[PDB]
Write a protein that binds this ligand. Sequence first.
Ligand code: PLP
Ligand code: PLP
Ligand code: NA
Ligand code: NA
Lengths: 388, 397
Amino acid sequence: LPVYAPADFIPVKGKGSRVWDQQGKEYIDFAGGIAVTALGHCHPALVEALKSQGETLWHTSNVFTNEPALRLGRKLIDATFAERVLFMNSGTEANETAFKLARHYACVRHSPFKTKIIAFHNAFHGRSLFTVSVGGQPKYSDGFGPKPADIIHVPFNDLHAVKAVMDDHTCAVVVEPIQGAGGVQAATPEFLKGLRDLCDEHQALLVFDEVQCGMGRTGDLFAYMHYGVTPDILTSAKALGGGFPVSAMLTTQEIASAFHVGSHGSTYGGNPLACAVAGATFDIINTPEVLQGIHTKRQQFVQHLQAIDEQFDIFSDIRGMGLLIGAELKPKYKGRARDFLYAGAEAGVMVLNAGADVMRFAPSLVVEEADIHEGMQRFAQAVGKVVA
Amino acid sequence: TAITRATFDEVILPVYAPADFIPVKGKGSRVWDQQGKEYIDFAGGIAVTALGHCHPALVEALKSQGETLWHTSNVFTNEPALRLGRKLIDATFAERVLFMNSGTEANETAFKLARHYACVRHSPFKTKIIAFHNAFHGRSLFTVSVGGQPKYSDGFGPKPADIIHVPFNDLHAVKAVMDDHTCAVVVEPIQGAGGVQAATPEFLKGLRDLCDEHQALLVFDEVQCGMGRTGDLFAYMHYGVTPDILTSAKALGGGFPVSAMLTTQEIASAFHGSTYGGNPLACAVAGATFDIINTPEVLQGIHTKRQQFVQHLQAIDEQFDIFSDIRGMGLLIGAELKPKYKGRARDFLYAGAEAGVMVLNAGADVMRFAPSLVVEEADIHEGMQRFAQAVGKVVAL
Ligand SMILES: Cc1ncc(COP(=O)(O)O)c(C=O)c1O
Ligand SMILES: Cc1ncc(COP(=O)(O)O)c(C=O)c1O
Ligand code: NA
Ligand code: NA
């Protein structure tokens, strides 16, 4: 089931979209550490922000505020629906904050009995007990003792099923606008708008988990902007820090006001070092030029994947948005995603899976055209070894 | 627009009430705000900056690894993670280490591991977790439910079940609630947040014996009391009681977000390399931190420095009659306020800040200090004189 590297593949150095291991073997990185290094490895602007803030102040706790956090909060507020933010360390933590907030808001504004959370089969929201129970893979939430209750799962993209389970006792709908791990499946426009309308009807909060699809990944700053559907709460991580552990939960003042002093917290969350790095990342990703390039680069990848399919006949579908790319394997290659991944690594290209039937790509948003061509040539060679 | 204290209220969720001032720079145990006012730091960002601010060795590790490789996913290991794992394994009971970002995440991992180990090695019905009143284990739904402060776990909908709370240091109560359906006892060897209360020796040894009797795992949350804080590398070493699982964070990265779950191979095998995970950058910094903290000289110094603080707190009490008890271990110090000042810890914290010294509380009745483990003697004396002035100002009123 899980993908792990053997003892002879230990990454030691990265620069841009290239990675070297202990043996000095060079790889083209189309995986980004699972869509994390959205500006590649050791990006000079990010290294500069790390080093300069690293000389000044790393940590003070939430007994205090700090300038890099306030600067970053201001940027996120100015660029999105958000009016308030909370910074944490990981996507899992941001989701914990979001889910607790949706629960607490319902409890204090409506009723302590308004507790149901609707989530989706194959969703991934993290590995904490609560977040993995909201996630939609029972294999990952089984076996840890009593799960937090009042979570209902229905199929992704099934609006009827959502309408059927939702009621006045529902506090939230939690959804990834594109399910990254779950086969790179994008919400349909009708489905996502439908969720907004149902949450409005039932006075439930719409929570978008944009940990994977946010911060430029789709070619808009956040996937919600592509759809034009505004959530009540949004979570962000991964690309937000370009490899530095940082995350954010975004909401409105009206919702945030349900939290009081002590309702939530974090030792490291809102760390000046993290926020200086995320500020630098944000300044680069949130530019017309970088967002446009994500679309150009997507089509460069897609054209290679189509060429590979023309030669080898291995894909049934190429999907995703921006530089989150899914390539679904044909029935003749069902369950082979891991083998194409390992073959890719032998050929010097790092890719991902999205379940056993789907190849996933999540390269740097600024991956050079020459790296796209070189890495896709390597991938084509790996494909040739698997099938030919 | 300039960034002010008012900016906080316009930007962050209202879960904190931060100080009037905004620290912009730190070096060692001194910190400066936007106005260039200089403070002595006896708080350490809540026991996190264990080597002070911008320690040259930690800055060097950050910059060196920062120009090399920051990030791998958990598919991979990396040299800094391997090195740090080896250091932790060599120095402790651990045979396996899993790295995460925060103390909350390390505790999630520990509690899920104790649960899953029971499930697969004993019975899916062996689920009870025993924890303690006033415990603090983090803010995720699971960890805050294992935590012993209902105020923090109420109001988020259905809590993960099968968690039983009894009083800290009450061994009989533990004996009474434990049974063959118990998977774990979770305990902070010293409850930091909970008034700086240390386990008694008989209590902690008692937990080990009861866990053995009932085939449950003993989980030590050393997020706050670990990584040198007590003057041993981990508090368990002071006590001579070996847990099955231990969690570490805060001091581990000296200010960089990093955490660790330590256990044996037998237990770790229930999860389906001696190390798992670990951000390269985080682990490089934590490795540099470990290299300094795990030295005879630094660990001895922690005890010297504790007595320098304690002598000051004693002098303050002699002059102002404010403390009923001075407690904790190493450079985790609690000073309990006398009944006349019950509930007024925040007043002394604010007066401290006005006087230019950063301190903590541990509930409304207890002052808490958690300075850099290498805080200079000159800073201890200066900061404690500032604190004496703050106490003087409060008591004069
Ligand atoms: C949609 C989604 N949410 C949450 C998470 C958890 O984030 P983290 O791994 O930063 O804890 C992930 C990680 O893959 C993700 O893909
Ligand atoms: C004993 C203990 N455990 C766990 C935590 C949670 O750590 P974090 O805030 O890094 O998630 C804390 C934080 O204060 C703590 O004191
Ligand atoms: Na806004
Ligand atoms: Na060992």
